[PDB]
Structure 1
Amino acid sequence: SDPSSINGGIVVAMTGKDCVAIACDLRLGSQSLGVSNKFEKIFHYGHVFLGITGLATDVTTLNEMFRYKTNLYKLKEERAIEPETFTQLVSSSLYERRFGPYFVGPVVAGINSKSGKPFIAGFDLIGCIDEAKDFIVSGTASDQLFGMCESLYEPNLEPEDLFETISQALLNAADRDALSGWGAVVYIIKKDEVVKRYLKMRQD
């Protein structure tokens, strides 16, 4: 009935020193039934990363929509869209469905390729931007993620430390939520390399 908690899922993003991290769980269910163990919630359009939680049909639809829009952007502008610009595009696109919204919690992460500045942003389902210096959380275990992030986080972490911090935030939040977990992925993003790691986590 409540569309934001039929399928389950979480996304968290964090900034470190000259890097960002974005992570998600892998579960897709229909309420109590876990259906898929491979449902990733993080996508990329060039060097800009988008995590989407919420109703899974809208997660898929929005990914396809932003792939469409960023492909056209790139053809017309002759360059890749930057995270600050993509954040505005997400907001515009969500707000144009104001009275029949996509039931989603998007999260943008990336490094501005010109200025080198790490960037993360979060949104509500109708496009209000939350541009945070520290972290962004989204999904069914958002309360749990807020608690983990607010205690575990410290500024200017190095990529390999940030990885431990974001992974522990995700793993422990997921374990206190019935509809999140079943696997996790963590992207560590620096200006010109991106490492992706699948975490070992409890499978219940």
Structure 2
Amino acid sequence: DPSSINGGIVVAMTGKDCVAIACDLRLGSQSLGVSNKFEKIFHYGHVFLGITGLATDVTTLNEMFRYKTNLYKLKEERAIEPETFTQLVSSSLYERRFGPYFVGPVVAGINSKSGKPFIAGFDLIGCIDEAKDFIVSGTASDQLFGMCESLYEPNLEPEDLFETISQALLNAADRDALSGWGAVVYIIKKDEVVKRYLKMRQD
């Protein structure tokens, strides 16, 4: 199936006045690993989007959303919020109901007005996972579910959230042949965003 040709994973988690989102770096073609630097996480203003699945669609969706959000900012005269972007992603996906993009997007961000952390996931045709502890996606989503349900607890400080989402991603990835090969982690607060590249197994 198309959603397991290139491989890769995304996970997002909420913490106290923070959210985090993470992904691996792999792009392969079946068993052949090809790119060691294929990030799966993008941002439009202060809203983050991670995307797993077919790499060509990952790239396409990014461009589509940069396009849509840029127009939004121009017309609305303010940058899009995570809640609103979430609906936009959903309807964009559903528009292709019968010829869908083979993706599993994930949204993370902090609403500029409430200061409230927000995450969501989607199936390939736009169904929204409204859950607000963690969201997982990709070829190691089973592993991720297991890691998150285990390691997660609510209202982690950013420094602690960083360890949690890191260990969830790293350990899930090492049990998946199609994921891994590097990772990036974003810790997102109101006034600061920190990106980090994790050290992991290279097999």
Match of 1:154 in 2: 153
Per-residue displacement from partner, 1:142-200 (whole Å, max 9, x unpaired)?
Answer: 00000000010000000000000000000000000000000000000001110000000
Per-residue displacement from partner, 1:26-73 (whole Å, max 9, x unpaired)?
Answer: 000000000000000000000000000000000000000000000000
Compute the RMSD of aligned alpha carbons: 0.3
Shift of residue 131, structure 1, vs aligned partner: 1.2
Scaled by the length of structure 2, what TM-score is found?
1.00
Task: Report the secondary structure of 1:50's partner residue.
Answer: strand
Per-residue displacement from partner, 1:78-127 (whole Å, max 9, x unpaired)?
Answer: 00000000000000000000000000000000000000000000000000
Distance in 1 of aligned mates of 2:16 and 2:97: 36
Scaled by the length of structure 1, what TM-score is found?
0.99
Task: Report the secondary structure of 2:170's partner residue.
Answer: helix
Shift of residue 9, structure 1, vs aligned partner: 0.3
Distance in 2 of aligned mates of 1:131 and 1:45: 20
Distance in 1 of aligned mates of 2:116 and 2:76: 21
Distance in 1 of aligned mates of 2:170 and 2:70: 34
Shift of residue 133, structure 1, vs aligned partner: 1.6
Task: Report the secondary structure of 1:40's partner residue.
Answer: coil
Distance in 2 of aligned mates of 1:192 and 1:126: 33
Distance in 1 of aligned mates of 2:72 and 2:42: 17
Distance in 1 of aligned mates of 2:185 and 2:123: 22
Task: Report the secondary structure of 2:100's partner residue.
Answer: coil
Distance in 1 of aligned mates of 2:21 and 2:191: 16
Task: Report the secondary structure of 1:72's partner residue.
Answer: helix
Distance in 2 of aligned mates of 1:29 and 1:151: 29
Shift of residue 132, structure 1, vs aligned partner: 1.2
Match of 1:6 in 2: 5
Distance in 2 of aligned mates of 1:133 and 1:88: 16
Distance in 2 of aligned mates of 1:198 and 1:108: 20
Distance in 2 of aligned mates of 1:192 and 1:101: 36
2:91 aligned with 1:92:
yes
Task: Report the secondary structure of 1:179's partner residue.
Answer: coil
Aligned pair count reads 203
